[PDB]
C-alpha cells in the first residue's frame, strides 16, 4: 500500500526506481509540487501530470 504499488496503478512503474534512489517516500512523494517534480528531474510531462494528479487526490479526504 505504498508508493510502488501507487505508481504501478498510474502506469508510472518504470519510475519506481528513480524515486527510491532519491529516497522519496509515499510521505514525502505526497508533499511534492511541479517545480519540486521537475527539479527531481521528471521531464516527462505526462508522467509529471499523472504524479500530480495522484498527490493531488491524496491530499483531498
Ligand atoms: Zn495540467
Same mark, same amino acid.
Given at each position: 500500500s505504498d508508493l510502488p504499488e501507487l505508481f504501478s496503478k498510474l502506469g508510472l512503474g518504470k519510475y &519506481? !526506481?528513480?524515486?527510491?534512489?532519491?529516497?522519496?517516500?509515499?510521505?514525502?512523494?505526497?508533499?511534492? &509540487? !511541479?517545480?519540486?517534480?521537475?527539479?527531481?528531474?521528471i521531464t516527462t510531462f505526462g508522467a509529471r501530470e499523472k504524479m500530480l494528479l495522484a498527490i493531488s487526490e491524496l491530499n483531498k479526504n
Open positions: &519506481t !526506481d528513480v524515486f527510491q534512489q532519491q529516497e522519496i517516500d509515499l510521505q514525502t512523494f505526497l508533499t511534492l &509540487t !511541479d517545480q519540486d517534480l521537475k527539479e527531481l528531474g
